[PDB]
Each structure stands twice: as C-alpha cells, then as structure tokens.
Amino acid sequence: VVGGTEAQRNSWPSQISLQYRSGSSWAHTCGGTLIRQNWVMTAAHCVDRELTFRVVVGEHNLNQNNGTEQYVGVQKIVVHPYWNTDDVAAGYDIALLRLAQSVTLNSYVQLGVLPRAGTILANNSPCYITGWGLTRTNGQLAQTLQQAYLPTVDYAICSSSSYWGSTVKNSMVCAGGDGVRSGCQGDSGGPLHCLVNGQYAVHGVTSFVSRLGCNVTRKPTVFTRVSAYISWINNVIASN
Ligand SMILES: *C(=O)c1cc(NC(=N)N)ccc1[C@H](Cl)C(=O)OCC
Ligand SMILES: [Ca+2]
C-alpha cells in the first residue's frame, strides 16, 4: 500500500498473508481474505506459479512474532475457469484456497463478510485497502499491515478514456486514483473493505495498477468485484 497508515492489530481480522516456500524461508507474495474457517479468497494471479503455498492468519508484522499467528498449509487451489494469466484485463482474477486445517476464530481471526450478489457501490463510496505490499512504486514491502482510504470510482468514470478506458470491465471495481495512495506490488489478492449499512464488507479482490506505477493520478487501483462471483464462490465451496 502506497500512502498507507499502519493498521491497528484487530481492525481487519479477515486479512491473510499468502506466502511461498522460498528456498528454505517463506516469502509474503499476496494478500487474501478468510471467508470460511478452511477457505481463503485471493487473486488467481497469486497462484500462477506452482509453488508451495501457506496462509498466515492473525498476522500483523511479517518479520516479528505477534503472538497471534496461525500458520496453515493450502490443501487445494481453485482458480476461476475463465482466468488467463496473459489477459488480466479480461478479469476473472479470483481464486479460492482450501486450507489443510480449519483455523480458530478470535479477535484477530474472523471471517470476511461478502456482499450480496450484483451489489454495485455508489461513486465515491468509503473503502479501505489493506496489505503488506510495496509502500512506494519500486519500493519494499511493508513490515506491518498497512491501510489506505480509497473511495470508489464508478464504472462510468473508470472506463472513461482519461481513466482506465476499455481495460476495466463491469466485473471490476476501481478505487482511489488520487496519485498519493494505492495498492502496489504484494497487495494483490487482498481485500477492499467497503462500509455499507454500517458494516464493512469485502467488495474487492485487489487485482492491478498502472504499468506506469502504483500511485498514478486517474489510474485507480483495480479490483475484482466480489459481488459478480457470489454464485461461483458458493458453488465451489459446496462442491469441495
Ligand atoms: C496480485 O495478485 C498479483 C500477483 C502476482 N503474482 C504473485 N504475487 N505471485 C503478480 C502481480 C499481481 C498484481 Cl498485477 C499486482 O501486484 O497488483 C498490484 C496492485
Ligand atoms: Ca508476525
């Protein structure tokens, strides 16, 4: 997250870190959301490589012991049948991960609330991006969870030539575009938490930013619109 502020410990308990076995260490690669005690929702872009994956819940500092962490293997990976690595503009950037164990819920570990199917936010809706990704374009990862306030930009504006134009689809959400805050590398897969009816729900899965850089004016951060995939999610879980 560029232009973030450090997240309080217990504010975003459905945020996870998706890590891969890097040599003999484990590296943060992505974010995700816990949606079931044994299911994680992240971006399909995060699993394009055939890596050994793990999920960390109750994580606040990647490099220190918080005293709250649960570390769980991934048992199964389900990418969206229409995902294609070479065409991220097409959308379908979503994956579900079945965990090798069910985690224990607590104040640091909760399920992500999903929107109702087909829900679309009003322009300039109040949302937060969270993640441990680059705090600058070509920077380094954050050690602590970061948050940024990132209003939505409706499809009408977002698909205008000045913004993203045709690269964005109605199956996406755009948020931000101020040139100061954004998501950035290592945030994708993660949540966009939007306040609706006085409850935070997860409306986006962080997908991409400009090639030009992370925090680019009139280049919002782009998300998979979760409320487009609700049947899909429920079908996979039912059947796995
Ligand atoms: C985000 O999901 C993502 C994932 C990957 N690959 C893995 N981290 N293993 C590459 C790129 C991205 C996107 Cl494009 C990204 O970083 O978007 C920044 C918001
Ligand atoms: Ca930690």
Side-chain angles (χ1 to χ4, degrees):
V1 174
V2 182
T5 59
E6 192 181 327
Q8 185 180 331
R9 279 178 191 278
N10 58 339
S11 309
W12 315 103
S14 71
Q15 170 82 59
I16 72 79
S17 168
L18 186 55
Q19 312 192 337
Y20 69 98
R21 207 223 324 149
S22 186
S24 193
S25 182
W26 289 94
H28 173 84
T29 189
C30 268
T33 312
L34 194 72
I35 53 168
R36 254 72 178 175
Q37 293 183 204
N38 71 155
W39 296 86
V40 161
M41 179 183 61
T42 183
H45 210 172
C46 302
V47 292
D48 278 350
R49 305 300 171 127
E50 310 189 58
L51 261 9
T52 303
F53 289 106
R54 72 173 186 178
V55 155
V56 193
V57 295
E59 186 65 286
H60 184 65
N61 195 305
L62 281 185
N63 312 97
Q64 293 186 200
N65 170 57
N66 302 122
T68 57
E69 299 90 329
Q70 304 173 57
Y71 303 90
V72 212
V74 173
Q75 200 214 83
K76 194 178 176 176
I77 296 183
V78 183
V79 164
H80 191 292
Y82 284 5
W83 171 240
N84 159 37
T85 324
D86 291 319
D87 185 8
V88 45
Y92 300 112
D93 192 16
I94 188 160
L96 286 185
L97 311 188
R98 176 181 250 277
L99 310 188
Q101 303 172 100
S102 302
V103 308
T104 304
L105 306 177
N106 55 48
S107 79
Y108 303 108
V109 184
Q110 297 285 321
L111 300 191
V113 167
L114 299 182
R116 175 184 176 232
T119 303
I120 304 279
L121 297 167
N123 193 52
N124 211 70
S125 283
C127 305
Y128 275 94
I129 193 182
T130 54
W132 285 275
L134 306 196
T135 52
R136 280 198 81 159
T137 301
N138 290 328
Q140 55 182 90
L141 299 175
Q143 296 200 204
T144 66
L145 189 68
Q146 297 300 291
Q147 70 182 55
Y149 182 71
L150 238 65
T152 63
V153 182
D154 63 35
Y155 173 81
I157 297 176
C158 197
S159 66
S160 80
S161 65
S162 305
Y163 284 73
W164 275 105
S166 207
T167 297
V168 81
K169 309 303 180 284
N170 187 248
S171 56
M172 284 166 190
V173 188
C174 306
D178 80 345
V180 177
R181 323 96 142 174
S182 58
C184 195
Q185 283 67 29
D187 296 306
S188 57
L192 185 63
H193 312 270
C194 305
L195 188 61
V196 163
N197 296 130
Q199 173 196 247
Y200 274 113
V202 187
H203 281 243
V205 166
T206 315
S207 191
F208 57 95
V209 289
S210 189
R211 246 195 289 127
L212 290 181
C214 289
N215 59 312
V216 175
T217 316
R218 304 178 284 245
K219 299 287 174 293
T221 310
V222 175
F223 304 81
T224 303
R225 192 163 50 90
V226 176
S227 68
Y229 291 95
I230 303 292
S231 299
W232 182 78
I233 299 165
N234 289 156
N235 281 154
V236 182
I237 297 180
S239 66
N240 286 240

